[model samples]
Target: YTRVVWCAVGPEEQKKCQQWSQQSGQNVTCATASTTDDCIVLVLKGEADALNLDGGYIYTAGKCGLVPVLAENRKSSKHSSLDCVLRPTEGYLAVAVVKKANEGLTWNSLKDKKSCHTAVDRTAGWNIPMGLIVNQTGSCAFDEFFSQSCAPGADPKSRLCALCAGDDQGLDKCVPNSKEKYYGYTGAFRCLAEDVGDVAFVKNDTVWENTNGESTADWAKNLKREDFRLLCLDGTRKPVTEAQSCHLAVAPNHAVVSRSDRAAHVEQVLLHQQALFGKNGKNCPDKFCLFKSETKNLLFNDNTECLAKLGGRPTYEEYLGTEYVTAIANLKKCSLEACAF
Candidate 1:
């Protein structure tokens, strides 16, 4: 069949994909996987055609020969005349956030401090910050760099997972799912908010989105944005609003990928699909909205405006950009053939 087969990670995403498939009148189909890597493997094995991925996983998928098709373009802080599907991607900022009360903490003084991360393999959460640390320290012992961390997806008994508190009932500590209280951007920020960790490796917007009455959830309800500060590469500290200037890295945006052979079909179908179900899509609001998950972020990020086309059909490496790609490659070098294809 010419239908595009999307790989949905987990049951929630599977249900979302089924709805999308039905809404599209079978123009798209679904393949299910428990995790991102498994989804990539399915795409490689031809069981699935495509899936969205963060830059770190993009490196993996690219290394495994799948090509980037379209990027997730989100709502910009400023208005743009360029169409969401045609504008160049302004990648998010990867930052280290610490509480203002931690008066002496700075980028240079991060050693032995507790940390929070979105996960072990995500761009903002792990690769960028860890890669930079590995680059600066001239060592690969990143696991021991922090005194302890709530880096979800690390081994449960390891110090890397030391600060992670599990679900509401405390069962899945460090499991890399939302069940883990320190899992994604929000969780990592919450870890910093609750004083469980001294530093949080997340993006610029996370702090802005959750602080000073922005988020009404219990933990974030009383949080103040002014109470937090961003750690810069030069060992200085800055306010969250300065992320564009003080971030550790401008990590590439998450994007969709597919085998080279299916790239054209996937891209074509996706363009038409988004037109019918995207943010302002014709059938959206009344029918299925491809990017409108309440919070699961299934299929695409809730903030996604559209899946923008790449200029000049850039390769995955080109799409991810040189410095970020080199950073990921350098970080992977410490694995001693463990990440080899």
Candidate 2:
């Protein structure tokens, strides 16, 4: 009853939670979940209390009666509302980025180019782009669009994984896992930097965040937003700084979620931890923290400044808003797994 029952995946996450649990003075305890689906099952069955979720899974969780309790708040250039909790969240913008000098690339002229994606089925990296392609092609056969691509979670034998440059041993390359070298937003961006992909599909903020001091990765140490360009739907290109005018779609935010029945207890326990390890917390400077970690998001987004009330949204459909729901619904039809287009 005293434990928080944090449902996290991976050894790194488990280790971090263990440290936090000890610091919680036995008030928090960690639980295990192997995948997002696994965590969902555990939470629904009452074996787990809560876990962080990607925007793609929020709808699934909501369908299962889970509620998003906290949101990750990064520096918003497009949003002025620091506390826009009550207002409709505009969400992250999906973008297709290329080196500014790569003049051969355009929205319609991307055939035969090497591509990078955060992962297969990801809202920004895969769903939005492929959904647009399905609209453009009237079919889901993306094999002809890009000559080679690195889409994690796709069948390794498929064209999607053809360009994937995997791990040190190279066995898990093109695998839909963190174990893959080019499998996430930052990793896809890295793929672009390393000249592995001519085009990188990712969140608009990805390039800017990595090129700036926000990331210390060796690949991004020398990059700048000015070094890249955004491919617009109109066959034109814009500077990376101008994503608002040129983007695939604005995706919903990722959130920390728990079953609706456990809302009060989950919020209470999370707030207690935040009061100690959060930015405004007493022990933040020296002892512990809730928002600073890397390599994985784990139970929360490190960029999150604070968690907010859901403004009375009852389900994930409501939390994600109408436009995004419609957009995602279309992606399911465009799904390469069932590609009929």
Candidate 3:
């Protein structure tokens, strides 16, 4: 009733969240967790109030009975007269990225190649791409499909974890937290940029944001947009700008989730907090910018405009859409515990 407790997934997120807590005058506080799954558990137990989740994790939390509160709305490609908080979310584009230098490597020839993913349970990173691959190949052996990968959250010794170069200390390899070098959207794209993997399963915004000097990160500072290509499902490659036509799927925007009982309070607090700290908020740039993270994207995506209002009291399934929910359910049957793909 007094405040919202945000679950930070790792040390960096904790640092940013601590800053946010202080800036909000204790209107928000922080709870620390090692992974998104653990954070979801904290929310379930009422130890934490809310945290944004990728669609894949949303599916997991929804199965356990969490409700979607608000959706992340980023810059729309088209002109919209609606304000950021009122604009409907247009989901991001999930695409397969490969180096332009890696000529002739199309979606059809990906067999036995090293790959990069944001993590095992993320939407663009895992579920969309892997589900398509599994359905296309008519096989559940997705681990065998990629000879090696940096899929954070897989067993450290597995091929899926092979390309994951841990933090600067080289510890915590393959962990799903941001500490891993190849963990999220930026990290997976970094894996592709560094030539550690043949393909990266990431969104179009990741490529655009990280390349062309848009990101100030040391590894991404000098990257050129022309050096990358998007792999289409039709076995052809296209420029990154053509993602709307070449992408594997359009994923639901990441959204905040909470226990049903806490949804209203969480929603109210977030709306007020963002009005003070959001992209164009009163305190942003001068005091704190909730959506901008220099490049780390600690709590929210760097591209996010605002946490827009949900159109209705949507169930998790309703928000994720029928097609995506079905795809995730189909992929779930592959037994992640036994195979760890």
Candidate 4:
């Protein structure tokens, strides 16, 4: 099937075009092509100041890249005749123009030339001749105002930039000590290495095994190496003893003492006395022990007495049964390694 299309033409030629289209069995639509032309003629003859062509058709055709002449110059007017066109093809042109005009008027009333120019420049590319001229003039006005307002405050020493330090509400210190002193502390690199070593040791062995046992011998061998020593060092020449201590504390009962001398003291506590609130009571009884001194005066010295009771050393089996052992085991095997670690 075929469809008909029509073009804008002089009113006298409309009947001829319609007849041609009818002969082809196609419908035709007509546009008033001479509206602006006739209006210009009327103005010259003093017939009308304005002619009305429905704005709806003008916008629709304009959006489809059709040009609609809006006005024409007359001999009497010295200024070039202004022709206005709608740019509905460019989305949001009307809304942008309205916003910019409103902002320009607002800033003009407030005597804020800079802001008025900014508003005007926002609508610059809409093909509005009057709009472009107004915005350009506003920009010039804004530059003039800036020169006058910023002159005294300009910095003499710096040619490229001006300092606003002397301005009353400028970049003054709002708080006396806003900048705080940050103390730098050492990080946990050695601690992380030690923990990794400890976990690797645990993974290869049952809870009761010693560090010297076949499974843990590889870890111990790595710890003793000179390269491992350098990597695990804190800033000081002294070894990363705290990290070593942490590893010893968490390792199985037999592994602890073999790893460090402090393990003996840890093992003693794990075995003999019941912990205060049973802090280290679970899993490994041989590994941790707690005891209160005399029940009398217990309020003041309960913890002191508990520490004083040096129960004899415990066997590896005793340590493995304590809650600490079970807790550590659960931590190592848990799916959320970050939380457990």
Candidate 5:
């Protein structure tokens, strides 16, 4: 049976708690109350398993004769609330103090001028002196003329000339182009980040590379080392060295060892057969029998190898191809540097 839990906290705190619960594979619901008394009543009604009340609310609820089963401390200055577990079930609870509660203040008013300053400060924190010096030196070698490649209709010749000329109009046009090119490189960087198993970078939907680089169809191969490392964490590809099959051995399982060491890490090619022809050996040419056996052994346990004999190749191929394309697209997005940026 799946257990459902309800929590009563302020809207923002409840949002955060719900997010945490979802990540932990729990289904969660949240509600808010105007006062502690109203929240306690909701708990007593079995509508909520937990009450997240401000510290002041806890005192108020105690005064109103609502006994808490368990309480936990919340250490944030912004959220002074505590989560109070209720009786009847050994459930969980949390509390946090609301940092800002002015109903009259608009979100835009809170964000407008200060946000940009905060972002700049954050950026500055990453610009270490050593890194800045390296960046400056690398900046000299950058192909500033590369920006023309992204301009809507800039002639390659004229764009190159303008870039060298360093005039105001040329510089202005070049800036956007250069930005695009930089972002393109960043996209590649992002892809590499994915390849390297930096799941957090991919999770945030960061751009890894620029548009020009991304426009190229075969951009996944250009992933950086770090990006590649992150991508490796995805576990999509079997290791090149052909370690023992990772699948647990259930009863009636069959295993196939390739005739040559060259076959190591060639799972995609081997799987290609199962994808092309159905699991059954029928309709497949005799010459492809070895490939078919490998495919069948990989997909089905011993007893199920002969499930379908004919015309399975085309159907499997189409289905596997669609899935492969989707997986590749995801991999490309994760490995591109601009995507992370």
Candidate 6:
């Protein structure tokens, strides 16, 4: 039987992937993996079959020898002809957000401001945003830009860790790993909202979806959309509703990845499965669905309209483009492993 390892963000999505496997009906099996690093390990070991990842992980995946089987096609046209993908995806774009009360923030730079970030190497939360600063400063002492930050993987005693409020368990306060409660997209946003930090580097949807009645979390359920604004590189602020015009930078679409050794077969199985179970296909009324219309990424991106041909762009460098490649390469100067969770 063919096996597909689904990289899940949490136990809930993991369960959904398992059910999807059972529904495959093509002699396919499903297993689950956790975190970007954990999923990569499982895929490499043959314990899992595939993992969907952000651009940063795609670069790492290519280095580890995985191939891109499918790229998501999104509805927006802000992407470049250089990236003009017959393939598509609306991977949450990166943005720098500040509370409405921070009236004096600048877009050109963040020198000496406090900050919040999701984790190291995360495309939106860390890489793209940090790449610009890293290139400017020519080193990894990001603490110089933001007086302090909650960047998860920074030295536990450094000013970077000073803003992280640790988990409920009170362990790994500034730890890069998941043990630190304030990690990932929502965690960084929370760190900013609580006034622990002045700016939160996250994706466009981070605040929009988490606020109002959109989420059940008390902190988010009552959040008014007016509380946050995006800081643009031109030294301007735009309402959250204007992200299409104000994003810090665009990113390569995310992809469903698999080991090259089995990529061909994996592609065969996926195309077969998608037609029968995709968006509006049979058995999708309620029993199961392949994509989520609303939510962030889990086993797959929430807004994945569908997967498209990679058009020969299998390698991460080929798919992620030169500027993105160059940006991450600049950041490669740091010992990512030291801070990686």
Better model by lDDT: candidate 5 vs candidate 6 = 6
On TM-score, the leading prediction is 3
Query: TM-scores for all candidates?
Result: 0.91, 0.87, 0.97, 0.14, 0.20, 0.81
Per-residue lDDT, model 5, residue 115, is 9
By summed lDDT, the worst window of 10 consecutive residues in model 3 runs over 332-341
Top-lDDT structure, candidate number: 3
Model 6 alpha-carbon drift over 4 Å, by segment: 9-13, 25-34, 76-92, 152-181, 293-296, 336-341
Cα error of candidate 3 at position 79, Å: 6.2
Q: What is the lDDT of residue 81 in candidate 6?
A: 58
Better of 5 and 6 by TM-score: 6
Model 6 C-alpha lDDT per residue in residues 218-247, reported as the tens digit of each score? 666667779888988778889999997889
Report the lDDT tens digits of candidate 3 across residue range 168-193.
Answer: 99999999999999999989999999
Is 4 or 5 the stronger prediction by TM-score? 5
Indicate the residue-level lDDT of 114 in model 5.
12
How many clashes show up in model 4? 19
lDDT preference between candidates 2 and 5, better one: 2
Every model: Cα RMSD to truth:
2.4, 3.7, 2.4, 43.6, 27.1, 4.4
Worst 10 residues of 1 by lDDT: 332-341
Question: Which segments of model 4 are wrong by more than 4 Å?
Answer: 1-16, 19-23, 29-128, 138-341
lDDT for 219 in candidate 3 is 94
Q: lDDT by residue for model 1 over 60-138, one digit each (tens)?
A: 8887889999999987756488889998888888999999988989999988989999898899999989988888899
Question: Which pairs clash (backbone N, Cα, C closer than 3 Å) in model 2?
Answer: 153-176
Sorted on lDDT, best first, the list reads 3, 1, 2, 6, 5, 4
Instruction: Write model 5 residue lDDT over 261-302, tens digit each, in one string.
Output: 211222233233333332343334532232222111111211
Q: Write down the worst ten-residue block by lDDT for model 4.
A: 178-187
